[PDB]
Amino acid sequence: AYTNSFTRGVYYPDKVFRSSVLHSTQDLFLPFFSNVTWFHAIHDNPVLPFNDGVYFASTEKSNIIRGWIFGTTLDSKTQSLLIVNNATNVVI
């Protein structure tokens, strides 16, 4: 399944304050109006590629989505990042 990303995934490129200015920068961004892939809890979390990087989102209220997993092979034969967001905290 797919939908339009519109403007999403703009982020502060560097930790510098600037104001009233049109700063120009070369970096990894989610391209404007690009298709996102969309997924559901009805019997859907296979190993995606990560490419140059991932924008992610969820629309929520249940808070059933509680983390992310990353690497090359994800099978102990390399170190694998686990992120959790349980109860109140990001935990890594």
Ligand X SMILES: *[C@@H]1O[C@H](CO)[C@@H](O)[C@H](O)[C@H]1NC(C)=O
> Considering the complex, what minimum distance in angstroms separates the CB of residue 88 from other proteins?
24
Of the candidates 31, 26, 24, the one whose C-alpha atom is nearest the C-alpha of residue 8 is 31
Binds 56, which of ligand X, other proteins, none (CB < 5 to 8 A, cut-off by type)?
none
Structure tokens at 35: 């298709």
Q: Does 48 bind ligand X (CB under 6 A)?
A: no
The span from the CA of 89 to the CA of 92, in Å, is: 10
Query: Quick one: 72 or 92, whose CB is closer to ligand X?
Result: 92
Of the candidates 61, 79, 60, the one whose C-alpha atom is nearest the C-alpha of residue 69 is 79
- Which range touches ligand X (CB under 6 A), out of 18-26, 42-50, 58-66, 82-90? 82-90
Q: Does 90 bind ligand X (CB under 6 A)?
A: no
The span from the CA of 51 to the CA of 21, in Å, is: 31
The answer to whether 38 and 3 have CB atoms below 8 angstroms apart is yes
List contacts with other proteins (CB under 8 A): 14-16
Binding region for ligand X (CB under 6 A): 2, 35, 84, 86-89, 91
